[PDB]
Amino acid sequence: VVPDTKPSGPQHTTKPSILGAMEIGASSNATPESTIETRYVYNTNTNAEADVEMFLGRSALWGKVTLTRQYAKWEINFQEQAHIRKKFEFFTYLRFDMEVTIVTNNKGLMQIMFVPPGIDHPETHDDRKWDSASNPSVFFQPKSGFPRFTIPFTGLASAYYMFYDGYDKPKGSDNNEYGIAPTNDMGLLCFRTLDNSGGNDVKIYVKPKHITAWVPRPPRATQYTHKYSTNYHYKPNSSGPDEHVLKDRHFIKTRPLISSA
Amino acid sequence: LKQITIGNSTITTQDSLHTVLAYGEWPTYLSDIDATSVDKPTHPETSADRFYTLDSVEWQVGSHGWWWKLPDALKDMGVFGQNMYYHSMGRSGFIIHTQCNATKFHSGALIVAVIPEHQLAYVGGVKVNVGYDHTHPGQSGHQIRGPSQSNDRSGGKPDEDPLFNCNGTLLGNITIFPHQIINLRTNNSSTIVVPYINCVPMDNMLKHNNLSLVIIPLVPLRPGSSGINSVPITVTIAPYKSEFSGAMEAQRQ
Amino acid sequence: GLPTRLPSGSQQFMTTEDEQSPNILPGFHPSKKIHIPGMITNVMHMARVDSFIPINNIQGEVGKVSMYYITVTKKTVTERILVLPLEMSNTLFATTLLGEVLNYYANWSGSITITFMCVCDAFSTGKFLVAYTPPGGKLPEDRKQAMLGVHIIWDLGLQSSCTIVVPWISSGFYRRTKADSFTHGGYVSLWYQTAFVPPVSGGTGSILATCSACPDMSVRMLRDSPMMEQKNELQ
């Protein structure tokens, strides 16, 4: 729980507990007992909805797909949806197991195949690579139940990179890849239907659990433009001859006059 | 009054604050419980762990900022740079001393932050990865040169806007990072001691830049009654507890 | 078999529920956990860091670094220099660390630290009155109406910063993040106490401000943030 308010009477001190210095890079220790005369207040309030396990462990939508010809394909990434991407980019390194719930409006018999990295995924339904001996696969009927499975921490590191300031190739290379694109791939999920009846919309709701967040970062103050890319200059119109202008898409609102709000 | 000595070098200051120790941890050596590679790492310990002072940048009026990637900036600085070019992996803490002093007639501020994994944005538009040459400028750093719609976009140029920290996250929230402010009214220097921050024990020091020291002129440089309109900023970076493993040929061209 | 029943709320997929799930890839050994410096366990520890308030968000200065400071001068009469309405949905607070953490939560309860720093030369001095009008009170528009609230008076010399602790004064136990008239937080106003006297006649100072959370600050009812949009598809 949060600390209680301590009582404080009138104080005439020579060491001020309210004159600090912003330049030292340390935040203030100032409580309300320094500035005013407080009373005792029993504070039973908690921040148990603000820890990383409760802040991030909520089952956000990570990706949408649409079955075109009884087939969908989604590579596992938190990068297509901006609301979970902002919450992950609060931090630099995140180590989490993830449970994956599939919400499909298809009626019939579906198959998910978690293709691990390094092999060819099935390029269609009725493909031969759906018949696999070792690729973990999930058969389910979407009526009477949603499927759910935990993918553990598959990292090649102690944590996932939310941000990477590096490249996968040395200096002389030409197809260099900035960012977190080469550092980790969580496989992909290949969807197919063995029936035909219902709809085509497949939603993938992924919940991070057993989370360990490692370096805090500023929350993003601009809308995302691409994925794996951290850009924020939105190029809105490609056709018309205002093409090379770039919107900013930030959230800082303006007030008409300071000292009047 | 302050004094920081790492071998064959010494930093001295007069009007200095508390030293910032980044995330409460000192730079350490890689423990055997946290190591992955099998070979014995090297430990230079006196000729690499020393204060290398980079080139001075000029804080004029209209200067938007500078940034130096680490350990990219020390790639030609002494035997730390030679051990970086000759080894497959490496880890290092850093002690970053930033010096800018003008007068009691000058005004201004400098937020001096150390960003782990400063993945810079593209300068704008299409889905283009930023270049290797533009995020590895050496000890010269990168003058931030301000936002404009007329900025060059040829070949993965990095973002030039200091307000969005050139990755889209707002300045002023940059104080979540290990930082200090050089306010010329009160102090003139800023020492930040950073441990090795990575989710991996050692990595290639040329491909990956772990830290990125960023200096932004928060408040402009007023000269006051004095005809000096621009004051140099010098950045003195010392590796600390640097180790390297997997020796190999020099990774130059 | 054993008589069971499936009451309402059994075959439902709630996103915020806590359930166990079958481990795909069994026998998977994860990579080992090393000591990475800086581990954060609670996002309130991000909210408790001083972060600069964009106190000059006017329609020219947004998009520039000069929205983080206001410029003060030597005046004869006392002027209201700056007003921060104590709202976590106001763009002054909601773009900071404290505000962008508290904008994820529908309620908040605690005290705010607001630290003002004046960047000027070593000869400029000044006294400022930083007043917090409690909820229910009008914005003061006079220093005699502002000094009746929670105020501090800070001198300028040998240290540029001073912190006003905006205390937790409220009827209810929690205050709404999106500010309404029922749970409004009040106002913080910066005044000239005696002046700002620089070493020249037309000299200036640049007042910044940072905000953070006190240790007794709490949040609840985690919701979406209004500080994030998505209008296009990220491809």
Binding site: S27, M54, T150, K209 | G24, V193 | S21, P37, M44
Partner: peptide, 25 residues
Amino acid sequence: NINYYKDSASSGLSRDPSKFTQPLV
């Protein structure tokens, strides 16, 4: 507190500020 799947990853949700706000020496 039962683990119905006999795996550590298969479980539910699991459970100091001064590294920030005062990173001094």
